[PDB]
């Protein structure tokens, strides 16, 4: 499960599993918001590529 | 490790090889309560001190 896999990824940078599970709702929003800015960053300035 | 279940019981095993173990207090660590975590399940965690405390 992707909720569980990120706990593996978190556990691989020195942060315990329970940090993700307790804040999964916040983290999902942070991941989604950051992805959205990618389209704008390419769409705004054409010098990106 | 990762918690697994054969459909009847629950075990903890290393994530890379199926070596199921009894969920004792030493096999896990505790942080919080049942509220925050999404997807938590109900089960029993064995305590190694029960036979020593009883006897
Ligand atoms: C998994 O998805 C199912 C879809 O039927 C849903 O009912 C359930 O609440 C979800 N369980 C967890 C642990 O996320």
UniProtKB/Swiss-Prot annotation, chain B:
Glycosylation site positions: 6, 42
Record note on what altering residue 26 to H does: In strain: Alpha/B.1.1.7
Purpose: Subunit of the fusion protein that is processed upon entry into the host cell. Mediates fusion of the virion and cellular membranes by functioning as a class I viral fusion protein. Contains a viral fusion peptide that is unmasked after S2 cleavage. This cleavage can occur at the cell membrane by host TMPRSS2 or during endocytosis by host CSTL. In either case, this triggers an extensive and irreversible conformational change that leads to fusion of the viral envelope with the cellular cytoplasmic membrane, releasing viral genomic RNA into the host cell cytoplasm.
Protein name as it appears in the record: Spike protein S2'
Species annotation: Severe acute respiratory syndrome coronavirus 2
Lineage: Viruses, Riboviria, Orthornavirae, Pisuviricota, Pisoniviricetes
